[PDB]
Each structure stands twice: as structure tokens, then as C-alpha cells.
Amino acid sequence: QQDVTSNFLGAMWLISITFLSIGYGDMVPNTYCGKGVCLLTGIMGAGCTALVVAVVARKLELTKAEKHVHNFMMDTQLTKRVKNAAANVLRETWLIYKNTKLVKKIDHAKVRKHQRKFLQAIHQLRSVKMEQRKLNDQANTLVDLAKTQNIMYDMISDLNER
Amino acid sequence: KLGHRRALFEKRKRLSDYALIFGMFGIVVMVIETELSWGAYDKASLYSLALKCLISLSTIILLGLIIVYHAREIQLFMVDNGADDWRIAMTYERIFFICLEILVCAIHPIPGNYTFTWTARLAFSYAPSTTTADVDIILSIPMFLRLYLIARVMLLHSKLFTDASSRSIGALNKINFNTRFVMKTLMTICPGTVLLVFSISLWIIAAWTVRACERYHDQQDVTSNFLGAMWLISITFLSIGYGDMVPNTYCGKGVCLLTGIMGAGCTALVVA
Amino acid sequence: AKVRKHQRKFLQAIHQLRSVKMEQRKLNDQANTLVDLAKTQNIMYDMISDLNER
Amino acid sequence: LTEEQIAEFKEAFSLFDKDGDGTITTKELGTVMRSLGQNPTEAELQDMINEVDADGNGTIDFPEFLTMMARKMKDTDSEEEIREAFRVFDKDGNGYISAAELRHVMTNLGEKLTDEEVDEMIREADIDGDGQVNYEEFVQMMTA
Amino acid sequence: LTEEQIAEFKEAFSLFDKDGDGTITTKELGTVMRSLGQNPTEAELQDMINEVDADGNGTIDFPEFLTMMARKMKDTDSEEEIREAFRVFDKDGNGYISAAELRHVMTNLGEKLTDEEVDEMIREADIDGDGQVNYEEFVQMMTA
Amino acid sequence: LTEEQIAEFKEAFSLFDKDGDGTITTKELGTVMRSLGQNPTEAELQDMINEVDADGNGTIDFPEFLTMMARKMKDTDSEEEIREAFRVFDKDGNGYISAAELRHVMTNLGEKLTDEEVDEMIREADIDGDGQVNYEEFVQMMTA
Numbered sequence: 001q002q003d004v005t006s007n008f009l010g011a012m013w014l015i016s017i018t019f020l021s022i023g024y025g026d027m028v029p030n031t032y033c034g035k036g037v038c039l040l041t042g043i044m045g046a047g048c049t050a051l052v053v054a055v056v057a058r059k060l061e062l063t064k065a066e067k068h069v070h071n072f073m074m075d076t077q078l079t080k081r082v083k084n085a086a087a088n089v090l091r092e093t094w095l096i097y098k099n100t101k102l103v104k105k106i107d108h109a110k111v112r113k114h115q116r117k118f119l120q121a122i123h124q125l126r127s128v129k130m131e132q133r134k135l136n137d138q139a140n141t142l143v144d145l146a147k148t149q150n151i152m153y154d155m156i157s158d159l160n161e162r
Numbered sequence: 163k164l165g166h167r168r169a170l171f172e173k174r175k176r177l178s179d180y181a182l183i184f185g186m187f188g189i190v191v192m193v194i195e196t197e198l199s200w201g202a203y204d205k206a207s208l209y210s211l212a213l214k215c216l217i218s219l220s221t222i223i224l225l226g227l228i229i230v231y232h233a234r235e236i237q238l239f240m241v242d243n244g245a246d247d248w249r250i251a252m253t254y255e256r257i258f259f260i261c262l263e264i265l266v267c268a269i270h271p272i273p274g275n276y277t278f279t280w281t282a283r284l285a286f287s288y289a290p291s292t293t294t295a296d297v298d299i300i301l302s303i304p305m306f307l308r309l310y311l312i313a314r315v316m317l318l319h320s321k322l323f324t325d326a327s328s329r330s331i332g333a334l335n336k337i338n339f340n341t342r343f344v345m346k347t348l349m350t351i352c353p354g355t356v357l358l359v360f361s362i363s364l365w366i367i368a369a370w371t372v373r374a375c376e377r378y379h380d381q382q383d384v385t386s387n388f389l390g391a392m393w394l395i396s397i398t399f400l401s402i403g404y405g406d407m408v409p410n411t412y413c414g415k416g417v418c419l420l421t422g423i424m425g426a427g428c429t430a431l432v433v434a
Numbered sequence: 435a436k437v438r439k440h441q442r443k444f445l446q447a448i449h450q451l452r453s454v455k456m457e458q459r460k461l462n463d464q465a466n467t468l469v470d471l472a473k474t475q476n477i478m479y480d481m482i483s484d485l486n487e488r
Numbered sequence: 489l490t491e492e493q494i495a496e497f498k499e500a501f502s503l504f505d506k507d508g509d510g511t512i513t514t515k516e517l518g519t520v521m522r523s524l525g526q527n528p529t530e531a532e533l534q535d536m537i538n539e540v541d542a543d544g545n546g547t548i549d550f551p552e553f554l555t556m557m558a559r560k561m562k563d564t565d566s567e568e569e570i571r572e573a574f575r576v577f578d579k580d581g582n583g584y585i586s587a588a589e590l591r592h593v594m595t596n597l598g599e600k601l602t603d604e605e606v607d608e609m610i611r612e613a614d615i616d617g618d619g620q621v622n623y624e625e626f627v628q629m630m631t632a
Numbered sequence: 633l634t635e636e637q638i639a640e641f642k643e644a645f646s647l648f649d650k651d652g653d654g655t656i657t658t659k660e661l662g663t664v665m666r667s668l669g670q671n672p673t674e675a676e677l678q679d680m681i682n683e684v685d686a687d688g689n690g691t692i693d694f695p696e697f698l699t700m701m702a703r704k705m706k707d708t709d710s711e712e713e714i715r716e717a718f719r720v721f722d723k724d725g726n727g728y729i730s731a732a733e734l735r736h737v738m739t740n741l742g743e744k745l746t747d748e749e750v751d752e753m754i755r756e757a758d759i760d761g762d763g764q765v766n767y768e769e770f771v772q773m774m775t776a
Numbered sequence: 777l778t779e780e781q782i783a784e785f786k787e788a789f790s791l792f793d794k795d796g797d798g799t800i801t802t803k804e805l806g807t808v809m810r811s812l813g814q815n816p817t818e819a820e821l822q823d824m825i826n827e828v829d830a831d832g833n834g835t836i837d838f839p840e841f842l843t844m845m846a847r848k849m850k851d852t853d854s855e856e857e858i859r860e861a862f863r864v865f866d867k868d869g870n871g872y873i874s875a876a877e878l879r880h881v882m883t884n885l886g887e888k889l890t891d892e893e894v895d896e897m898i899r900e901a902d903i904d905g906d907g908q909v910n911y912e913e914f915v916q917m918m919t920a
């Protein structure tokens with residue numbers, strides 16, 4: 001006699017919150033029927049939520065045809081970056097030599113700054129080349145391995161005639 | 163043949179940004195006005211009129227920009243797919259989507275002064291309450307739907323999908339460069355940043371919405387506190403459950419339901 | 435009006451024809467992964483072993 | 489064409505054309521396609537390199553590259569898809585279709601037409617009147 | 633090196649030297665490499681064993697194995713990355729780089745230099761005054 | 777018997793015969809199976825194409841297809857599992873079962889039968905005193 005759990009919207013809210021395992025708030029069943037229904041809804045939700053999560057996680061994957069284009073898109077890059085990183089090393093290895101063996105007066109600050117930039121350029125060049133190996137490794141282990149197997153089997157069967 | 167083309171992509175790119183600016187201006191103004199109206203000045207003062215005429219004007223220019231961006235898209239369709247009359251490109255889906263966009267972008271608090279009656283039952287005590295609310299709160303909240311323009315601008319400004327060689331290679335393989343492809347690529351390359359940004363952006367918006375909704379039936383400063391609502395949203399997101407703070411109105415309950423539904427998948431994705 | 439209506443229907447038919455030929459390759463891609471790859475390996479190994487004694 | 493669009497497709501010709509020489513051969517195409525996980529056969533590679541080459545030299549060049557990268561980039565060729573729709577029902581492998589099968593498929597498979605309409609289609613389809621439709625000149629005369 | 637380091641070096645040498653012989657051959661190296669999941673070919677194995685072989689024998693001994701193990705453990709050997717940076721733009725598999733290409737890459741790829749500086753670099757780098765600029769020199773000269 | 781069933785049967789027949797020759801050979805039967813992921817061998821394919829054929833032609837006929845399809849769609853022919861139950865104990869591969877083995881398996885395996893029942897058997901099962909009781913006739917006499 002308080003219009004709390006006998007309200008359709010209140011019951012809807014209670015079922016929704018118990019389905020998601022959040023828990024009750026100020027609304028709890030007064031009878032055993034409501035408790036049994038809540039138990040059934042919770043048991044069903046404990047598997048329904050996991051199944052829905054798995055489905056929505058699988059729906060966000062790229063297909064093989066899209067992968068074959070994304071690989072080309074990524075390989076179009078990772079080469080401009082490599083060239084840009086490799087040119088800086090060649091620039092600094094010349095700047096240091098110029099400033100240390102060409103000028104009449106040796107300015108130490110410029111030499112120190114260029115020697116500091118040289119290590120950064122070297123580290124960037126070394127870092128940019130790991131992505132290429134990672135991309136190659138992940139682009140591998142994707143071949144069918146069956147069409148070539150059948151082709152080789154047919155060739156060996158033909159060669160069996162000697 | 164690159165003469166008429168490359169003269170419409172730039173136009174669309176500019177129109178998207180000019181629409182985004184006026185879209186965010188109205189949101190900033192509504193937040194400022196709704197925060198200031200609760201004590202600084204009454205609804206009958208001239209400040210409310212001055213701060214709402216600006217929102218109306220911004221909405222007018224936003225609609226004007228949209229109804230031209232769509233025409234530019236139609237012209238691009240005519241250029242690409244060989245056609246002479248523009249009625250070839252007008253189907254049911256296009257008209258329905260244009261009408262939906264106009265309806266979504268044509269909501270704002272109209273200047274004036276109107277009130278209605280609001281009743282609710284207090285939680286944990288079962289005591290009725292009755293206050294005279296304002297009509298502007300009903301129309302102010304749906305203005306957050308203008309956030310798809312950010313996604314549109316980000317899609318149009320991407321440096322990956324805009325490459326011509328990639329488009330040609332993808333057309334050789336017969337694939338579509340729609341929004342789903344971009345979303346899947348972003349999830350493939352940077353899966354954590356997207357989740358972090360989405361969660362952080364949702365947190366403050368949901369907290370502010372709950373605070374704005376539950377301030378008419380709260381004379382104890384429990385759920386009408388920004389730090390008292392952010393905590394509630396955080397504990398509801400993680401499925402721990404409510405403590406001594408439960409919504410007194412249906413708006414808070416709906417917001418909590420949406421936050422819980424989003425979290426039930428966000429947590430699993432982050433864990434993976 | 436008939437020409438415009440039929441051109442719209444032609445575009446719709448083209449776009450619905452191009453969509454149905456992607457499932458025909460998704461099915462093949464997902465079905466080609468069920469090969470045992472061991473029986474054929476053993477058969478080829480036996481054949482090469484027999485060919486060794488030329 | 490914008491100079492940026494010329495530096496593009498050139499940054500790609502550099503990818504396809506390894507070891508310089510300004511030429512793309514079957515081996516280079518096979519290597520770059522296998523680097524992506526694909527495993528084309530010899531016939532497929534030969535067909536791919538034949539669909540682009542126009543010199544008859546057997547090698548692809550940048551002018552032979554820009555004439556296809558500027559067409560597959562945009563638009564939607566209807567003449568490349570009407571032929572596919574025609575050859576869906578041509579399982580033999582030749583370039584001919586029998587009139588009886590054409591009439592049957594037009595009058596029994598999807599949005600069926602009337603007898604008079606299909607009869608008119610056949611009468612303006614069989615120019616030679618020999619009972620064997622080519623469906624190639626039938627595309628050239630109609631689409632163009 | 634201390635005695636303990638020699639002990640770990642001998643222990644590690646024992647893994648490659650499986651059946652004895654006091655020597656590591658190509659077969660032993662291939663077996664130990666493939667036991668870890670790697671799949672090197674014959675050319676790669678020969679290159680690996682050549683990078684360490686000293687007395688033109690084809691087999692690796694402990695005196696020639698102790699070396700390079702105290703060098704690939706500390707420092708960075710910048711003379712090993714400068715050559716890689718040069719080889720980045722040397723796709724022909726040779727030991728020379730074109731002067732015009734070198735000027736172009738130094739001018740229009742990353743932290744662009746001035747015309748006078750690159751001109752001075754080209755003039756100083758060309759000892760023989762020829763278009764085929766060597767890069768083993770200019771790395772064995774400046775990095776003294 | 778209805779026209780609809782004939783329609784689905786013809787549609788299914790169209791799958792196997794890739795060409796329009798109206799024939800199913802060892803090539804199509806096996807190309808389809810490898811398209812479905814199966815990996816049959818030559819002997820298995822030969823047996824499958826053999827045990828549907830009627831007019832000793834090697835190629836499979838549409839009436840031959842219908843005869844097998846109209847029977848392999850309903851009911852469970854007991855004469856197909858009785859022979860399998862006989863083959864369970866026929867490890868050698870011939871068509872004969874020794875009387876002693878049959879008596880032993882009937883007396884010791886399953887629910888077991890008394891000595892009198894198995895004595896009535898054999899003497900009734902075997903139509904001769906050879907001792908090499910055939911199981912192919914004890915299906916066409918007892919269960920027919």
C-alpha cells in the first residue's frame with residue numbers, strides 16, 4: 001500500500017537493475033514470488049550479458065579483404081617516416097664534423113647540441129624499424145596453405161610417372 | 163576530371179567546420195545560462211532574453227549551413243554517378259535522413275517564460291513532493307545530440323582515407339570506405355585511446371545531466387552536488403551498486419541505466 | 435519520369451547485386467580453414483620417399 | 489591533376505617497382521602481393537599484369553599506371569558491371585548466350601517481363617538472326 | 633674480463649657446440665637456431681657464420697667467439713648505424729650513391745638544409761670528383 | 777513426385793555439374809568437396825562416384841541422381857545397419873565369418889543367448905558344413 005513495487009515502471013526498473021547485476025536500491029521484493037523472479041532474471045542475465053559482449057567484440061573485426069587493403073595502407077606509410085628519420089642522422093653526422101674540424105674557432109655549445117641531437121636521431125631511426133618487422137610478422141601466418149599444398153600434390157603425382 | 167572535383171571537397175570541409183563552431187557555441191551558452199539562472203537572476207530578467215536570442219540565431223545559421231552542405235553532397239553525387247537531373251539522387255532514405263538531421267538540430271529553449279507542475283516520490287522515505295518547474299529544462303537537455311558533427315569533421319579530416327592511391331587500391335578490391343571501416347581501423351590501431359576518451363567524455367556529461375535533473379526535488383545537497391553525482395556515476399559504471407544515493411526522478415534513473423549498459427561492455431573491452 | 439524512375443531502379447539493382455557477391459567469398463574464406471593438412475602431407479611424404487629410390 | 493596527386497601514385501610506383509629500373513615485372517608484383525599475405529598463382533599474376541599493359545612490352549610503366557589509377561579512383565563504370573551480369577549466366581566460358589535461355593531467364597527469374605517485351609528484346613538483340621546472341625555488341629549498342 | 637664472465641661465455645659456447653669438435657659448424661648453428669622456432673635459410677646461416685669467422689676456416693672457435701661478445705654488449709657503435717642510414721637510400725645493392733640523388737634527399741627530406749651547405753658537402757664528399765659517390769668512405773673518414 | 781521436389785532436385789544437380797555437359801565426373805565431385813572444405817582422396821572419390829552409377833558409364837545421370845535422392849531422404853533401411861553390424865566383427869575384409877567366432881560373440885557379448893539358441897543358429901545360419909558362414913545371405917534370407 002505505497003505504490004513502490006506495484007508500479008509497472010518501478011518493476012521495470014527493478015528488473016533492469018537486477019539483470020545487469022548492479023543490485024537493488026530501495027526496492028526489494030516483499031514476497032517470495034518477486035524474489036524467485038529476480039533470481040531467475042539474474043541467472044539469465046549472468047550469461048546473456050557475456051554472450052552479448054562476445055558478439056559485439058567479434059563484430060568489430062576486419063575481414064580478409066579489408067585486411068589486405070589495410071596492410072597496403074600501413075605499408076604506404078612507415079617509409080616516409082623511415083626516410084625522414086634516416087636523413088637526420090646523415091645531417092647531424094656532417095654538422096658535427098663541420099663544427100669540429102672546419103671553423104677556425106671551436107664553439108663548444110653547438111657541438112654539444114649536435115651531439116645531443118645525433119643520439120635522438122639514432123634512437124628514432126632504430127625505433128621506427130620495429131614496426132616494419134611487426135607488420136610483416138602479423139601479415140604472415142595468414143596464407144591459406146591449402147591451395148599450394150594441392151598444387152604441389154598434383155605436380156608430384158604427375159612426376160610419379162617418371 | 164579533377165576540374166569540377168577537388169572544388170567540392172574543400173567546400174564540404176569548410177562547411178563542416180563552420181557548422182561545428184555554431185553547434186558548440188549553443189552548447190556553451192546553454193550550460194552558462196542554466197548554471198547562472200539558479201540564483202543569480204530570475205527567469206523574467208533581460209539577461210535570459212539576451213542569452214537566448216543568441217542561441218536562436220546560432221540555430222538559424224546552423225540550419226542554413228546544413229541545407230547547403232547537403233546540396234553540395236548532391237552535386238558531388240551527380241558529378242560522380244553519371245546523371246543530368248538532380249531528382250535521380252533523391253530517394254526515401256536520403257529525405258528521411260535529412261529530415262531527421264533537421265529535426266535533431268532544430269531544438270533549443272525558445273525565449274519566454276513558461277512553467278508546469280512536477281511531482282515525484284522521494285527515495286528511501288516514500289514521501290511525495292511537488293514543485294513548479296520550468297519548461298526550458300525539457301528542451302535544453304536534447305541539445306547534446308549535436309555531437310555527431312565532431313565525428314563528421316574527424317572523418318572528413320582524416321589523412322588515411324583521403325589518400326587517392328589507397329582509394330584506388332580499395333576500389334580494385336571492391337570495398338566500401340564507409341564509417342564502419344574507419345571505426346574498425348581506429349579500433350585496430352589505437353584501441354585504448356578511443357575507450358579512454360569515450361569514458362572520460364561520458365563521465366562529465368552524465369554527471370552534469372544528473373545534477374541538472376535532480377535539483378528541484380533535493381533540499382539536502384546529496385544528488386544535486388557535482389562531486390555527489392560524479393561518484394554515483396562512477397560506482398554505477400563499475401556495477402558495484404548504489405549506496406545511500408539513488409535517483410529521486412526518472413531522469414536520473416534513465417541516465418544510470420544508460421551508464422550501466424555502456425559500462426557493461428566498456429569494462430570487458432578494456433580488460434581484453 | 436519513366437526514364438528517371440528506371441535509372442533509379444537500375445542503380446538500386448546494381449548496388450544490390452554488388453552486395454550479394456561478398457558473402458559468396460566470405461563463406462569460401464571461412465570454409466577454406468577446415469583442411470586437415472596432415473593426410474596430404476603424409477601422402478606427399480610417402481610419394482617423395484618412393485621417388486627417392488629412382 | 490594536382491602535383492600532389494602526381495607525387496601520389498609515384499610514392500606507390502616506388503613501392504611496386506623495386507630495385508629501380510623503372511619497370512614492374514611479374515616477379516616484383518608477386519613479391520609485393522605475397523608480402524601482404526596474398527598467394528596469387530602464375531595465371532592470376534599474368535592476367536593482372538595483362539589487364540594494365542598496353543604497350544605489349546610485358547612491363548608496366550608510370551604512364552600505364554596513371555591511366556588506370558585516375559579511373560579506378562572514382563566513378564562507377566556501368567559497362568564493367570552489365571558485362572558481369574551477362575556472364576553470370578554464361579558458365580561455358582565463351583562469349584555467346586543462347587536465345588532460348590536468355591528468354592527463359594528474362595521471363596522467369598525476377599521481376600518477370602511479358603512475352604511481347606522479351607520477344608522485342610530478342611528481335612532487337614539477335615542482329616544476325618542465327619539464334620546465338622553475343623551480348624557484347626548488345627552492350628556496345630545499348631550502353632553507349 | 634673477469635673469470636666469471638669467461639665462465640658464462642664458455643657455458644654459452646657449450647650450447648652451440650653440441651657434439652664437440654671444439655668447433656661450431658653450419659649444421660650445429662642451424663640446429664640450435666631451429667630449436668628456438670626460427671627458420672633460417674642456407675644463405676642467412678652462411679652470412680651469420682661469415683660475420684664471425686676470422687681465419688677463413690668456416691668454423692668458429694672459442695678464441696674467435698670470445699671477441700664480438702664483449703662488443704655487442706655495451707655502447708652503440710654509431711659507425712654501424714650510419715652505414716644503415718646510407719643503405720636506406722641505396723636500393724640497388726651496391727656501394728655507391730648518386731650525387732644528384734644525395735643532394736635531393738638532403739634538400740627535400742627532413743630538417744632541410746640550405747643550398748650552400750649541401751653544395752659544400754657534395755664538393756667535399758666527392759674525393760674523385762665523380763657522380764658515383766662512395767659511402768664506405770665519408771664514414772671511414774669523418775668518423776675517425 | 778510433385779513438381780516442386782523435381783525443381784529442388786534439378787537445382788541441386790546444377791551445383792555439382794559446373795559445366796553444361798549434364799555430367800558429374802570425378803573432377804566436379806571433389807572440386808565441390810574441396811570447396812566445402814572436405815579433402816577426399818582418389819579411392820574415396822572413386823567409391824562415391826561408383827556407388828550411385830547405373831548404366832556403367834562413369835558419368836552420373838540425372839535419373840541416377842533421382843533414384844538415390846528419393847530413397848536417402850526418408851526411412852531407415854535396416855538392411856544397411858545389419859550388414860554394418862556384421863562388418864563390425866569382420867576385420868579381415870572378406871565376406872565370410874567363422875562359426876566359432878560368431879558363436880563366441882553371440883554367447884559372450886551383449887545380452888547373451890543360451891547354448892540352445894546358438895545351437896539352433898549356425899546349424900540354421902550355415903547352409904553348409906564348410907564352417908565359413910556367410911553373412912551376406914543371412915540378410916537376404918532371414919530379413920527378407
Ligand SMILES: Cc1ccn(-c2nc(NC3CCC(F)(F)CC3)cc(N3CCOCC3)n2)n1
Pocket residue numbers: 068069072331334335504512517524536537540548553
Ligand atoms: C592489396 C593490393 C595491392 C595491389 N593489389 C591489386 N593490384 C592489382 N593490379 C595491379 C595494379 C598496379 C599494377 F598495374 F602495376 C600491377 C597490377 C589487381 C588486384 N586485384 C585483386 C582484387 O581483384 C582482382 C585484381 N589487386 N591489391
Ligand SMILES: [Ca+2]
Pocket residue numbers: 505506507508509510511512513516
Ligand atoms: Ca623493377
Ligand SMILES: [Ca+2]
Pocket residue numbers: 541542543544545546547548549552
Ligand atoms: Ca608497357
Ligand SMILES: [Ca+2]
Pocket residue numbers: 649650651652653654655656657660
Ligand atoms: Ca662441432
Ligand SMILES: [Ca+2]
Pocket residue numbers: 685686687688689690691692693696
Ligand atoms: Ca674461424
Ligand SMILES: [Ca+2]
Pocket residue numbers: 793794795796797798799800801804
Ligand atoms: Ca560435367
Ligand SMILES: [Ca+2]
Pocket residue numbers: 829830831832833834835836837840
Ligand atoms: Ca550414369
Ligand SMILES: [K+]
Pocket residue numbers: 021022023401402403
Ligand atoms: K553488484
Ligand SMILES: [K+]
Pocket residue numbers: none
Ligand atoms: K563480471
